[PDB]
């Protein structure tokens, strides 16, 4: 009689470069979307060795990046002027699903997203 652990990290990134509305001189507006989802209540909500997911997006001049350990999923999509790299690192124990995937945000009509799964029912 043993338990089971199944947690997957899914991050969606999109971007849109287009003015749409005729500007007066210079008004280049772009779009951007970033969401971070994962399991916890299904794959045991208790840590073992490491288990820590840290998301990163946009320039590092920010006050604080994204973190995942005891908080709900994230999802922000709006229009603005930016365009910078974005990488997400996932951890579970040691050699279960510890992986990191880098991405970039600066292309008209971007549709780049990753989905990684992690399973550790025994070890």
From Swiss-Prot:
Which protein is depicted? Transcription initiation factor TFIID subunit 14
- In terms of the parent sequence, the fragment covers 1 to 123 of 244
Q: How does it assemble?
A: The 1.2 MDa TFIID complex is composed of TATA binding protein (TBP) and the 14 TBP-associated factors. One copy of each TAF1, TAF2, TAF3, TAF7, TAF8, TAF11, TAF13, two copies of each TAF4, TAF5, TAF6, TAF9, TAF10, TAF12, and three copies of TAF14. TFIIF is composed of three different subunits: TFG1/RAP74, TFG2/RAP30 and TAF14. Component of the SWI/SNF global transcription activator complex.
Its source organism is Saccharomyces cerevisiae (strain ATCC 204508 / S288c)
- Give residue numbers for the site Acylated histone binding: 104
Q: What is this protein's function per UniProt? A: Functions as a component of the DNA-binding general transcription factor complex TFIID, the RNA polymerase II associated general transcription factor complex TFIIF, and the chromatin-remodeling complex SWI/SNF. Binding of TFIID to a promoter (with or without TATA element) is the initial step in preinitiation complex (PIC) formation.
Which gene holds the coding sequence for this protein? TAF14
Main localization, broad class: nucleus
**A cellular-component GO term for this protein:** transcription factor TFIIF complex
Which residues belong to any copy of the YEATS domain?
A: 1-123
């Amino acid at each position: 009689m043993v338990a089971t652990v199944k947690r997957t990290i899914r991050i969606k990134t999109q971007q849109h470069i287009l003015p749409e509305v005729p500007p007066v001189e210079n008004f280049p507006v772009r779009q951007w979307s970033i969401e971070i989802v994962l399991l916890d209540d299904e794959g045991k909500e208790i840590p073992a060795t490491i288990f820590d997911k840290v998301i990163y997006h946009l320039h590092p001049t920010f006050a604080n990046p994204n973190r995942t350990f005891t908080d709900p999923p994230f999802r922000i999509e709006e229009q603005g002027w930016g365009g910078f790299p974005l990488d997400i690192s996932v951890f579970l124990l040691e050699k279960a699903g510890e992986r990191k995937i880098p991405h970039d945000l600066n292309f008209l009509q971007e549709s780049y997203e990753v989905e990684h799964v992690i399973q550790i029912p025994l070890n």
